[PDB]
């Protein structure tokens, strides 16, 4: 004499409210991998220490020793990318099942999930996929696209063109759904209206679509354009989340271990001119070989995914 | 009979295309049993019944055509008068002492004196109308109902004598050889439990431990010598202290009858049963009240009520059974007297398995300061309504309500070992004062459990039967069913409890982690709802060909919401062909009564109720940016939106043969059941958010044959005997299963769910260490087998390069615990007024891994041991077969590898033993009083009987054990033997 | 509020029987309070003998 | 979360023997003699859990400052009562001339 088979479990937390889905998405935001710093380890701007217990982790990354790395070398977090992608996809698939929330709040939750998915696919395809501008790379299989929450499916690698098409589609989906112009400073990791434009500008810059890159950079620059004047303040880092330059303080690019285990080579520092506030604000005092430790990261307060300084250069290059 | 009941509709025997087993429940077939699941052993071919315990009220493990799931419902479905029963599942546990805390099934509340038949649905053609609950088999219960006529009043009284449990098969060391072993160990370098024992406490008290070690018996003072010789001559009968014979009572009164319009049945039963362990017992009082009214020539309404009340009294033990009287029979020292010469308590401080001697145990103090009491109140009501629209169309609806409330109460007083161990486990270290304290307050503990299982099921069916041209018969049924189930438990604990004052004391837990080690109040709740749509069809042509089919659509809240799998059918197609009713074979009709071939194919389902389609998470207060903290949800379980039932694709080919006026019936059934989409843990690709999840992926196969032979050997005016041989062979294999990377025992893939893998040993070497085999077949020691390396030379610093995937190859498959060959022989003789029933049941082909008689590293000399310790290798007995007691003084690397890998010794092939036993389940002799004597006393009928239960077991040897199926769990009493006298009167 | 009752009685020269099923749901004037009762009655009487 | 469980049980057994006679058509006598044994149980259990999450069904520990405040907020209490009654009764009635 009973039906309506829809009784949920009463032993755990099953997210149904907009508050619970925001908690789930915040947990997803927490686990965004710090793999862009590990990738920049392969560039000319970082130098691992000369001691052991630090060469075994990052040396093979530094030397591009892909074929025969050390067993204990630091690995790229492929699992965390797809965990955050799973949670983003869950929030996307729950659009109409989110209760106890106004249409604007739910729409912004889904837009943040869309932009998180686009950003994760973007950084993943730039880590493990051939560059878009490279000839013969638009049809090379780079990474699988996590576009659902399926568990009994094996994902195959998508071509770079398909991945970038998905990224652009998700940016467009988020553009019509994020409706928060500014977030609190403590909550600033969440994507704001300008985050969509900043991500579009970066994606178009990486793709080579200069007109769209300039359009997006100017669109965000019409609202947020104030920079950090370090001639007035010679010790203020734009990388700081409290800065007026920050747009999304999501990704702490340099982890504690990675920051503590790298110097800045003198060859890179030679790019700075004599009068430059970045020369002293970013790094510490020289050493025996002129190598400087960087004070621009390594702790969670230097969290930054997008900011105005990057968009100025995006517009300039476009 | 010519009717088969499936719980949904009635099938004529000539139209039955399914594999169905049938048993008639009566005193002559079923012996003086008290549960209807203990009466099924050896009487249905393909239904294997195993005893969980010998304790009163303990459930039985029933498997129909093998095991059908790896992690799911493995128990059959019990159907009472068309309404499925809840609470009949037998939960499995890894802790061997949990067998002492098992929960009774609802089947225990049903008097077999009220059941008429038991029909077991084995095939896909028989079970596929149950959909998601069909894979494990269905046992449908038909209850007795009143017959049209004068009231029939049956009184039955049974008086049972249960002989005491004789612990002579346990092969324990008597006081003389126990003291001899303790003296021999005190002289050697074996140093474990050196502080434990009675010899080492007598000698250490006077201070000649070193004097005895160097000198021996001579170096011992006359006073200590007289103390030891007094120890040797102290003999205690622990079987008499712990166990006893019992007298059990059973009474039943039934009154049936009927009108042309109303049929009625009433029954009252009460039994009291005692266990062989002193202080345990179980009484059951039940009432049955059935009635059926013909409201009209079309409408018929019936109400059936079964109310039940069972009271169980027993002992509570530790979590790991150091108090357990059944295990204590193998553990108590033969020279330890529980009482002083002045009548005071003497404590056993060697109960703990470690070297600690601080908490003392007394069985007389435990039976006085400790109590476990449970009460089960059960109700089951079925309302049936039937409406005959035509002579062809008929609509029948049914509502079944079921309630089962179990209230348990465990009390441990301050002066008991249970409370002592509970207090000891509360030891904690406080930083405020550098010391160790106990947060559990001084006093007792009172624990209260309340578990309620409720169910409401509603079924509606519409059946249409037609015949065309006298040679076509069509039966079509269409139904719906809604079933909701609740399970709610509450547990409460109070420490500082005074038994007489009923007061309590506060507990200050140091952490929230210790607050869960000693839970004070917890509540669990579970709801489930199920919606099903049916259809059955049957078409018979020329009374010779029958084609049947079943379709069922099942939906539940335990399944995912994906549209791809939501409503998938659970169908069946079957066909009967009666070769006997064929015009080309009518010549062989003077001697052949029946030839028929059944072929069935179907899809069965199973529900795993421990898995959910929902995002189960937890709240964590973390922070992404400095200064901003918020609640976040961490995913504990993945949201499987494709969660579904577990498929079982099965085929069945059966032969029915009957010759010489049913002088010999044969029924063979070969079946193959391939189960796929089984729910289990899978190592998923990382492209989903998770490393592993429980999903529908695994596979199993159960393939076999069942044979039922029924012979009428002689039929004379006076003497007549019949034989029933039931046989079944089943082959179980796990086809796909995920094995953890860090698991060294091999997986079951290609082997039964109950597979036993053991490390085959080449015997013993010249020093008494076990000897192994390598891949070349050469007798290899543990150092060579594991390639042990000790670079530091300190002994305990030993290491091995052998990977888990390579340790997996050291194990070889022995056999399955689940016995492949099962069945029984039932002989029934009758001679005038005398009737003799002999029921024998065989389980052949199994293996059981028994716990080692003694550990060669951790042997506790403060506890009693088998005589197997006398067969061990010693320097004085160099031809001993069992491994010697080893020390770290010699071969330190091997000793400390055996020490950390404690499962190498426990998985040796010498502790695995065969399981081939025949058991005399029942031997009954009856006598019906002559009609003259019954008429003299005004009795419609009278009968007496003497029954013997479990009087004889033979087969493979079970040495050092009390029962062939007591070889796995030492914490459960063996199946009792009984001699019962029954008096039945028919007024 | 709802109430339903179904009773079936009868008798023989030797057995008299009564059965009854009732169910009511009642609500209180205060919002959120209510009480339902479901009950069964099953009486039977047999003349085993004169 | 507060949980109460109150159980009231009773078992009563009565036996009576009645004798009815009439004499001379004007005397009627009815005599009844009986015994009764009745036993009653009343058992209550109360349990309380603070820190309770309704959806998670979890609980949090309570540290009472004293034993007096541990009774102001009882966490687990049990009450039990048995009673037994034995009765022997008789009735008589005598009617004359209706």
Tab-separated table of C-alpha atoms in Angstrom, chain B residues 451-728:
chain	number	residue	atom	x	y	z
B	451	UNK	CA	15.616	-3.491	16.339
B	452	UNK	CA	12.316	-3.163	14.456
B	453	UNK	CA	11.740	-4.683	11.014
B	454	UNK	CA	8.464	-3.666	9.365
B	455	UNK	CA	7.043	-4.467	5.946
B	456	UNK	CA	3.835	-3.778	4.046
B	457	UNK	CA	3.249	-5.483	0.703
B	458	UNK	CA	0.219	-5.207	-1.567
B	459	UNK	CA	-0.392	-7.453	-4.572
B	460	UNK	CA	-3.118	-7.416	-7.199
B	461	UNK	CA	-3.518	-10.086	-9.873
B	462	UNK	CA	-5.959	-10.766	-12.676
B	463	UNK	CA	-6.110	-14.256	-14.161
B	464	UNK	CA	-7.906	-15.444	-17.286
B	465	UNK	CA	-8.289	-19.125	-18.177
B	466	UNK	CA	-9.823	-20.317	-21.435
B	467	UNK	CA	-10.094	-23.490	-23.498
B	468	UNK	CA	-10.645	-23.648	-27.257
B	469	UNK	CA	-11.623	-26.685	-29.351
B	470	UNK	CA	-10.961	-28.890	-26.272
B	471	UNK	CA	-7.259	-29.088	-27.248
B	472	UNK	CA	-6.048	-25.525	-26.557
B	473	UNK	CA	-5.742	-24.237	-22.994
B	474	UNK	CA	-4.606	-20.690	-22.236
B	475	UNK	CA	-3.852	-19.138	-18.849
B	476	UNK	CA	-2.833	-15.473	-18.611
B	477	UNK	CA	-2.100	-13.553	-15.407
B	478	UNK	CA	-1.278	-9.848	-15.049
B	479	UNK	CA	-0.417	-8.252	-11.716
B	480	UNK	CA	1.086	-5.346	-9.823
B	481	UNK	CA	2.817	-5.164	-6.455
B	482	UNK	CA	3.924	-2.369	-4.124
B	483	UNK	CA	6.141	-3.282	-1.187
B	484	UNK	CA	7.710	-1.001	1.415
B	485	UNK	CA	10.157	-2.018	4.133
B	486	UNK	CA	11.537	-0.283	7.230
B	487	UNK	CA	14.450	-1.305	9.437
B	488	UNK	CA	15.164	0.798	12.526
B	489	UNK	CA	17.707	0.055	15.243
B	490	UNK	CA	18.481	1.899	18.468
B	491	UNK	CA	21.358	1.153	20.835
B	492	UNK	CA	21.898	2.741	24.252
B	493	UNK	CA	24.632	2.104	26.818
B	494	UNK	CA	25.037	3.092	30.444
B	495	UNK	CA	28.227	2.723	32.477
B	496	UNK	CA	28.421	2.806	36.233
B	497	UNK	CA	25.236	0.744	36.201
B	498	UNK	CA	24.069	-0.730	39.497
B	499	UNK	CA	21.878	-3.743	38.804
B	500	UNK	CA	19.719	-3.332	41.912
B	501	UNK	CA	19.512	0.475	41.869
B	502	UNK	CA	19.354	0.935	38.059
B	503	UNK	CA	21.508	4.063	38.285
B	504	UNK	CA	24.269	5.234	35.957
B	505	UNK	CA	27.444	7.324	36.071
B	506	UNK	CA	28.797	9.880	33.586
B	507	UNK	CA	31.586	9.077	31.129
B	508	UNK	CA	34.144	11.694	30.070
B	509	UNK	CA	35.655	10.538	26.790
B	510	UNK	CA	39.116	12.004	26.081
B	511	UNK	CA	38.359	12.418	22.361
B	512	UNK	CA	35.590	11.957	19.830
B	513	UNK	CA	37.426	8.840	18.612
B	514	UNK	CA	37.071	7.125	21.988
B	515	UNK	CA	33.437	8.257	22.104
B	516	UNK	CA	32.799	5.899	19.172
B	517	UNK	CA	34.834	3.050	20.655
B	518	UNK	CA	32.254	3.037	23.481
B	519	UNK	CA	29.058	4.258	21.807
B	520	UNK	CA	26.435	5.553	24.216
B	521	UNK	CA	23.419	6.166	21.965
B	522	UNK	CA	23.196	5.364	18.266
B	523	UNK	CA	20.281	5.162	15.849
B	524	UNK	CA	20.010	3.602	12.392
B	525	UNK	CA	17.124	3.918	9.942
B	526	UNK	CA	16.451	2.430	6.515
B	527	UNK	CA	13.481	2.626	4.131
B	528	UNK	CA	12.995	0.846	0.837
B	529	UNK	CA	10.160	0.850	-1.686
B	530	UNK	CA	9.565	-1.536	-4.583
B	531	UNK	CA	7.111	-1.360	-7.499
B	532	UNK	CA	6.632	-4.356	-9.780
B	533	UNK	CA	4.462	-5.305	-12.748
B	534	UNK	CA	3.912	-8.939	-13.665
B	535	UNK	CA	2.724	-11.191	-16.390
B	536	UNK	CA	2.586	-14.957	-16.784
B	537	UNK	CA	1.289	-16.889	-19.781
B	538	UNK	CA	0.822	-20.593	-20.425
B	539	UNK	CA	-0.437	-22.370	-23.541
B	540	UNK	CA	-1.106	-26.118	-23.560
B	541	UNK	CA	-1.822	-27.992	-26.791
B	542	UNK	CA	-3.375	-31.467	-27.004
B	543	UNK	CA	-2.666	-32.060	-23.293
B	544	UNK	CA	0.879	-32.794	-24.436
B	545	UNK	CA	2.855	-29.620	-25.249
B	546	UNK	CA	3.055	-26.711	-22.821
B	547	UNK	CA	4.747	-23.367	-23.454
B	548	UNK	CA	4.996	-20.882	-20.612
B	549	UNK	CA	6.483	-17.438	-20.150
B	550	UNK	CA	7.029	-14.844	-17.446
B	551	UNK	CA	7.810	-11.130	-17.644
B	552	UNK	CA	8.451	-8.809	-14.724
B	553	UNK	CA	9.335	-5.131	-14.397
B	554	UNK	CA	10.955	-4.102	-11.117
B	555	UNK	CA	11.706	-0.654	-9.766
B	556	UNK	CA	13.173	0.340	-6.440
B	557	UNK	CA	14.854	3.198	-4.625
B	558	UNK	CA	18.039	1.087	-4.485
B	559	UNK	CA	18.446	1.306	-8.269
B	560	UNK	CA	19.817	4.126	-10.367
B	561	UNK	CA	17.574	6.613	-12.130
B	562	UNK	CA	19.122	6.091	-15.578
B	563	UNK	CA	16.511	5.523	-18.282
B	564	UNK	CA	18.741	2.939	-19.984
B	565	UNK	CA	18.300	0.354	-17.212
B	566	UNK	CA	15.311	1.583	-15.200
B	567	UNK	CA	12.640	-0.843	-16.431
B	568	UNK	CA	14.340	-3.856	-17.963
B	569	UNK	CA	12.422	-7.138	-17.950
B	570	UNK	CA	13.190	-10.213	-15.854
B	571	UNK	CA	11.639	-12.794	-18.141
B	572	UNK	CA	11.485	-16.563	-18.590
B	573	UNK	CA	10.431	-18.995	-21.309
B	574	UNK	CA	9.820	-22.676	-20.613
B	575	UNK	CA	8.426	-25.711	-22.371
B	576	UNK	CA	7.106	-29.098	-21.283
B	577	UNK	CA	6.707	-32.046	-23.644
B	578	UNK	CA	4.972	-35.139	-22.259
B	579	UNK	CA	6.454	-38.049	-24.207
B	580	UNK	CA	4.101	-40.473	-22.462
B	581	UNK	CA	0.907	-38.912	-23.866
B	582	UNK	CA	2.055	-39.532	-27.418
B	583	UNK	CA	0.283	-41.872	-29.859
B	584	UNK	CA	3.566	-43.428	-31.005
B	585	UNK	CA	4.373	-44.419	-27.399
B	586	UNK	CA	0.913	-45.537	-26.225
B	587	UNK	CA	2.217	-49.107	-26.425
B	588	UNK	CA	4.505	-48.464	-23.442
B	589	UNK	CA	1.637	-47.292	-21.255
B	590	UNK	CA	0.876	-50.457	-19.279
B	591	UNK	CA	4.130	-49.970	-17.341
B	592	UNK	CA	5.127	-46.319	-17.911
B	593	UNK	CA	3.065	-43.698	-16.098
B	594	UNK	CA	4.926	-40.535	-17.072
B	595	UNK	CA	7.669	-39.294	-19.380
B	596	UNK	CA	8.190	-35.560	-19.715
B	597	UNK	CA	10.938	-33.173	-20.784
B	598	UNK	CA	11.160	-29.612	-19.493
B	599	UNK	CA	13.437	-27.002	-21.037
B	600	UNK	CA	13.577	-23.582	-19.402
B	601	UNK	CA	15.565	-20.414	-20.016
B	602	UNK	CA	15.354	-17.201	-18.069
B	603	UNK	CA	16.830	-14.042	-16.604
B	604	UNK	CA	16.838	-13.698	-12.803
B	605	UNK	CA	17.806	-10.722	-10.685
B	606	UNK	CA	19.327	-9.910	-7.330
B	607	UNK	CA	19.324	-6.723	-5.254
B	608	UNK	CA	22.394	-5.621	-3.314
B	609	UNK	CA	20.869	-3.522	-0.539
B	610	UNK	CA	24.192	-2.311	0.899
B	611	UNK	CA	24.959	-0.136	-2.145
B	612	UNK	CA	23.321	3.164	-3.035
B	613	UNK	CA	22.772	5.243	-6.190
B	614	UNK	CA	23.299	8.475	-4.235
B	615	UNK	CA	26.212	10.796	-3.546
B	616	UNK	CA	27.139	9.816	0.004
B	617	UNK	CA	29.508	12.412	1.420
B	618	UNK	CA	30.670	14.055	4.634
B	619	UNK	CA	31.059	17.599	5.916
B	620	UNK	CA	34.590	18.943	6.372
B	621	UNK	CA	35.480	22.481	7.437
B	622	UNK	CA	38.450	23.377	5.238
B	623	UNK	CA	39.551	26.622	3.586
B	624	UNK	CA	40.947	27.519	0.165
B	625	UNK	CA	41.998	31.112	0.850
B	626	UNK	CA	43.480	32.411	4.126
B	627	UNK	CA	40.890	33.794	6.506
B	628	UNK	CA	37.911	32.206	4.789
B	629	UNK	CA	36.650	28.915	6.196
B	630	UNK	CA	33.501	27.150	5.033
B	631	UNK	CA	31.810	23.773	5.075
B	632	UNK	CA	32.761	21.423	2.253
B	633	UNK	CA	31.439	18.002	1.250
B	634	UNK	CA	33.950	15.218	0.636
B	635	UNK	CA	32.632	12.339	-1.470
B	636	UNK	CA	32.627	8.993	0.333
B	637	UNK	CA	30.727	7.025	-2.327
B	638	UNK	CA	30.316	7.739	-6.022
B	639	UNK	CA	26.813	8.415	-7.395
B	640	UNK	CA	26.162	5.316	-9.515
B	641	UNK	CA	23.212	6.409	-11.654
B	642	UNK	CA	23.307	3.052	-13.488
B	643	UNK	CA	22.839	0.945	-10.352
B	644	UNK	CA	20.631	-2.038	-11.102
B	645	UNK	CA	19.995	-5.656	-10.227
B	646	UNK	CA	22.474	-8.460	-10.871
B	647	UNK	CA	21.693	-10.533	-13.952
B	648	UNK	CA	21.539	-14.335	-13.854
B	649	UNK	CA	21.050	-15.997	-17.248
B	650	UNK	CA	20.016	-19.576	-16.529
B	651	UNK	CA	19.015	-22.672	-18.489
B	652	UNK	CA	17.511	-25.895	-17.158
B	653	UNK	CA	16.855	-29.246	-18.831
B	654	UNK	CA	14.792	-31.694	-16.815
B	655	UNK	CA	13.456	-35.221	-17.158
B	656	UNK	CA	10.417	-36.582	-15.316
B	657	UNK	CA	9.930	-40.354	-15.357
B	658	UNK	CA	7.422	-42.536	-13.519
B	659	UNK	CA	6.872	-46.263	-13.995
B	660	UNK	CA	4.823	-49.160	-12.569
B	661	UNK	CA	1.984	-47.196	-10.937
B	662	UNK	CA	4.441	-44.741	-9.361
B	663	UNK	CA	6.457	-47.744	-8.131
B	664	UNK	CA	9.531	-45.662	-9.183
B	665	UNK	CA	9.677	-41.917	-10.011
B	666	UNK	CA	12.828	-40.192	-11.258
B	667	UNK	CA	13.364	-36.465	-11.748
B	668	UNK	CA	16.660	-35.200	-13.160
B	669	UNK	CA	17.542	-31.540	-13.722
B	670	UNK	CA	20.754	-30.257	-15.311
B	671	UNK	CA	21.162	-26.505	-14.879
B	672	UNK	CA	23.609	-23.815	-15.954
B	673	UNK	CA	23.341	-20.368	-14.325
B	674	UNK	CA	25.733	-17.646	-15.502
B	675	UNK	CA	25.461	-14.552	-13.310
B	676	UNK	CA	26.783	-11.260	-14.652
B	677	UNK	CA	26.537	-7.606	-13.642
B	678	UNK	CA	27.389	-8.706	-10.119
B	679	UNK	CA	28.025	-5.833	-7.719
B	680	UNK	CA	31.566	-5.663	-6.382
B	681	UNK	CA	34.558	-3.394	-6.034
B	682	UNK	CA	36.273	-2.615	-9.343
B	683	UNK	CA	39.558	-0.834	-10.015
B	684	UNK	CA	38.231	1.938	-12.246
B	685	UNK	CA	40.208	4.010	-14.755
B	686	UNK	CA	41.327	7.320	-13.310
B	687	UNK	CA	39.343	9.310	-15.896
B	688	UNK	CA	36.383	9.030	-13.585
B	689	UNK	CA	36.803	10.755	-10.313
B	690	UNK	CA	37.635	7.626	-8.348
B	691	UNK	CA	40.180	4.843	-8.045
B	692	UNK	CA	37.574	2.186	-7.216
B	693	UNK	CA	33.839	1.859	-6.607
B	694	UNK	CA	31.211	-0.841	-6.112
B	695	UNK	CA	29.546	-1.287	-9.518
B	696	UNK	CA	27.819	-3.982	-11.585
B	697	UNK	CA	30.735	-5.776	-13.198
B	698	UNK	CA	31.582	-9.197	-11.708
B	699	UNK	CA	30.584	-12.692	-12.868
B	700	UNK	CA	29.949	-16.164	-11.460
B	701	UNK	CA	28.793	-19.543	-12.767
B	702	UNK	CA	26.819	-22.238	-10.933
B	703	UNK	CA	26.435	-25.371	-13.031
B	704	UNK	CA	25.212	-28.762	-11.913
B	705	UNK	CA	22.638	-31.527	-11.712
B	706	UNK	CA	19.943	-32.594	-9.239
B	707	UNK	CA	18.358	-36.057	-9.040
B	708	UNK	CA	15.240	-37.011	-7.068
B	709	UNK	CA	14.391	-40.720	-6.963
B	710	UNK	CA	11.329	-42.062	-5.149
B	711	UNK	CA	10.776	-45.824	-4.968
B	712	UNK	CA	8.018	-47.975	-3.469
B	713	UNK	CA	10.191	-50.973	-2.663
B	714	UNK	CA	7.465	-53.222	-1.235
B	715	UNK	CA	3.713	-52.732	-0.823
B	716	UNK	CA	2.012	-55.549	1.099
B	717	UNK	CA	-1.204	-55.531	3.139
B	718	UNK	CA	0.838	-55.190	6.350
B	719	UNK	CA	4.422	-54.205	5.470
B	720	UNK	CA	5.381	-51.454	3.041
B	721	UNK	CA	8.480	-49.314	2.694
B	722	UNK	CA	9.423	-46.409	0.456
B	723	UNK	CA	12.753	-44.776	-0.378
B	724	UNK	CA	13.528	-41.153	-1.286
B	725	UNK	CA	17.018	-40.401	-2.610
B	726	UNK	CA	17.773	-36.718	-3.179
B	727	UNK	CA	21.133	-35.870	-4.729
B	728	UNK	CA	22.643	-32.648	-6.024
